[PDB]
Design a protein around this ligand. Structure first.
Ligand code: HEM
Ligand code: HEM
Ligand SMILES: [C-]#N
Ligand SMILES: [C-]#N
Lengths: 155, 155
């Protein structure tokens, strides 16, 4: 049930302060196109992943949907839209399961996004050392939570 | 093939310097029992996960195997034992797939370990701010890589 899954999201985010939620959301919104670019560079360059993707599908649909996915993940806690976000993650998971996207590639995708966001946070001059470190831990937690809910469809 | 998967591990780690490999491996070896404790606290407390675990199995087998798993992951790059590590990850994945461990719980497990290791690195006074930040990015990369190879069994 989405109401149950919303608690898991809420609890995970409640480990951090709104300052981490905002620092993460700002770096993601300012770089969402560049994050989509990096995601599809990594996937299209591997033939095992490129097997499931066309250049047309990524150009006209997925590049934009990835940006929307990122905005949704980092908006959930600040806008208190937990139930709606987990419901969306659930449906995204159902799409991947239906067409047999290997789960190991989804985890690699999450890994690539966590890496690039945390690299961008390290460069963010507006944040202190402790602020950035807290934000990077939150990025890993919230991205992994999103991907966990995407992976419910595989069981 | 493990030789192919070893390249993926090598490439992922080659993004960082030996200083990140060593800082990560030291915090993990010094806290491996405490990391196992946190892992099994999180799993045994959730009834959906506790469904697949007995207190006896964790006490007498898995608590020790989790410590061994952690040591293996953070030894691979420093000891250049890439092929052996990926081969071990592959077999660990086969165990979980055989007994239908939900993949979403494995990702949650990886998330819990990444969080606690990065929290311990933040507290490590022997590291500078940039050193810790680089090490935390490596922890997320290498843990996620290990879990990716565990998840090959699910496809
Ligand atoms: C964490 C990683 C991923 C995220 C966040 C993600 C995100 C999404 C989203 C939001 C959609 C919905 C698009 C639409 O149907 O409206 C989607 C669909 C899709 N994804 Fe992913 N995805 C991920 C991993 C992957 C991987 C690894 C592959 C393949 C190698 C893949 C291939 C696809 C395909 C083929 C569709 C269906 C597009 C269409 O036919 O509608 N995705 N993904
Ligand atoms: C990233 C997460 C995980 C890691 C690193 C991990 C590690 C391992 C390792 C190294 C083994 C081999 C033990 C042995 O057979 O020699 C194992 C087996 C096993 N794991 Fe996990 N595991 C993870 C996730 C999970 C989850 C989420 C569950 C269940 C909720 C689970 C339940 C089991 C069970 C039941 C066995 C078989 C024990 C026995 O019958 O031999 N594991 N795991
Ligand atoms: C999904 N790209
Ligand atoms: C596997 N505990």
């Amino acid at each position: 049930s989405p109401e149950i899954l919303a608690l898991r999201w809420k609890d995970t985010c409640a480990h951090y302060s709104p300052h981490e939620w905002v620092a993460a959301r700002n770096v993601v919104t300012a770089n969402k196109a560049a994050l989509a670019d990096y995601f599809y560079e990594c996937m299209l360059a591997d033939p095992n992943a490129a097997f499931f993707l066309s250049d047309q599908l990524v150009k006209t649909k997925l590049h934009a949907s990835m940006q929307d996915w990122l905005e949704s993940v980092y908006a959930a806690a600040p806008t208190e839209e937990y139930e709606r976000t987990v419901a969306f993650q659930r449906k995204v998971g159902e799409v991947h399961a239906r067409i047999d996207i290997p789960v190991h590639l989804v985890t690699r995708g999450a890994c690539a996004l966590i890496r690039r966001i945390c690299e961008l946070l390290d460069r963010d001059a507006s944040l202190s050392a402790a602020q950035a470190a807290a934000t990077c831990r939150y990025v890993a937690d919230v991205t992994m939570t999103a991907v966990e809910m995407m992976c419910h469809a595989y069981s």
